[PDB]
Symmetry: C2
Subunit: 141 residues, 2 copies
């Protein structure tokens, strides 16, 4: 079951400049930063609030680490801005299987590693009225 | 201060078809629907979760009622997709004034009515690294 907005993915050319913009303008601190070599992105999560399902809502600021990354190619085409939205669930595997069975294109055959040890998958934006959509389960405890 | 993600604003050609997609695919349902002739939209709010500041987070699906709308013009140029993000605050007026004073332009000189009797304003996307950013104070 999708029970929260987990994050908004925001692509930027310069992660350190964009992080400083969110910090200086709104007072939002970096919760966690990491590099995902497989995706070719450096990410900063800014925690905005906690959620009623036990999770949290973040801004996920993303910079490409190389030209051949999905995010680097998206930025070259569209400029900086909102890249994707993410919904949280206790069961990414079951939800992804349910949505694939409805005919939605699921970009990965199985969930992959995401921010802070999460497991994630994506839905094709052309099946989601133009919105690149991520499904997220937080790290297991 | 900005204490939650209040909503994601998603522009679409056909609100009813888009709502059915979110209902059928994710099991979301419509919390509130309204026609706003000032903004020139029809909008549906789908409540996804409650938030730790006492508010809630929504998807806001927006269809144009006329082509001379911020949203109607944006769809012609961009196609369907994410149009804005919105942050909740207890005092939209105070936070907009503080943010203007930092050099980020505010699109309205005074806040306007938004969905569900909220009080809203927007920050200029070219001052926000390409993200059209709304500030929202919910009704009592
Ligand atoms: Co993400
Ligand atoms: Co809005």
């Amino acid at each position: 079951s999708l029970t929260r907005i987990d994050h908004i993915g925001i692509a930027c050319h310069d992660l350190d400049a964009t992080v400083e913009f969110y910090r200086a303008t709104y007072g939002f601190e970096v919760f966690h930063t990491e590099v995902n070599e497989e995706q070719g992105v450096r990410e900063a999560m800014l925690k905005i609030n906690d959620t009623s399902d036990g999770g949290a809502s973040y801004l996920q600021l993303l910079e490409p680490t190389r030209e051949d990354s999905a995010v680097g190619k998206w930025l070259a085409k569209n400029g900086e801005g909102v890249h994707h939205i993410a919904f949280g669930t206790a069961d990414v595997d079951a939800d992804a299987a349910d949505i694939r069975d409805k005919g939605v294109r699921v970009l990965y055959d199985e969930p992959r590693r995401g921010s802070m040890g999460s497991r994630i998958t994506f839905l094709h934006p052309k099946d989601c009225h133009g919105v690149l959509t991520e499904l997220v389960t937080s790290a297991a405890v």
